Symmetry: C2
Subunit: 200 residues, 2 copies
Amino acid sequence: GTKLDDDFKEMERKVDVTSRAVMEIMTKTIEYLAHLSSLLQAEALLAEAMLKFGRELGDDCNFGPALGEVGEAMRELSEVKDSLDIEVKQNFIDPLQNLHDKDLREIQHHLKKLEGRRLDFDYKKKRQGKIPDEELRQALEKFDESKEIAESSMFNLLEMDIEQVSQLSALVQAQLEYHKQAVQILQQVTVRLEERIRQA
Amino acid sequence: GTKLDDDFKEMERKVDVTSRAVMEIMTKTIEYLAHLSSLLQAEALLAEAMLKFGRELGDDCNFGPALGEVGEAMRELSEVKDSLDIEVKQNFIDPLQNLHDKDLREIQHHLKKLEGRRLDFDYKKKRQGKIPDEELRQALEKFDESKEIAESSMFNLLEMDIEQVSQLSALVQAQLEYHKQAVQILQQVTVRLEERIRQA
């Protein structure tokens, strides 16, 4: 039947990939944040157990207040991990989700409508003499018209891809913010333990 | 029956706590490393999925090579997390495990032997005239002797607690090493994305 130019085709492939990537990347980033939460929880637990025994054991010794120093340090890291979840979630996931329920969905729609209009024209073309020229003409009009709409929505999404890179950036952003935030917490308690071991 | 001085008692309590702490702390640190591995895995997956779609999508655009830049960055972080597991495991867990199968176990043993010898003396004391003085004397000798052995092993463990603090330090060590190691990886790719978004 009717065939679409290669440009249109390549443009479609890219949109496809993009759409599928945004799909998996998003699901796996969610699975990722699941385990992050899981670890974050376990962290806080270990942290408490420390703050706890460091209590019971008493502070007249060394291991007692140390379990307390490392204790809170561990728990603060824990809370920073939670902040990270929230960051990734609303600055990377949500945007991609919105891209999928808005732009990608709409493209998919136009593409379906284009296919329908294409098939319908190929059919009405088969019966050229049988059907009134006006009807055929419209069939062709509708096809061209749908092709144009699909080309625009696809093109606009593909041309705005620098924003996907901003989103990837957003992820790496919150990522770096957490690790830097943590290097502080740790580096701090890493000096307090340096003391004790020195007041040895 | 026979009672042990308060110093001996307090010394016993501390040893108890310490022993129990080293127990939970260790189990929870293991549960912690479990989830760390779990997240680490999920990270690498997301990382691959990126390196993948960034491939398929192609590099003639922006999102393609970006998914590749953030792609490996994510995977390298993943591998650093694995290094961290190994660190915590052999520089914090293993030491504590050895403390539990060596020093703590031995104390527990001495303590049991002390109890036996105590109970046995209280019994042989009940039957003072009934049993030969020599036997009673030995019973007392054995008790004092076991008490001394228990006091030494407990005291030595409690006096060497600065080493627990070194271990806590070891944990916080590997912890800080990972986060600093990561701040690099990220900070790096955080500048490469700065470029693309600038060559916009």
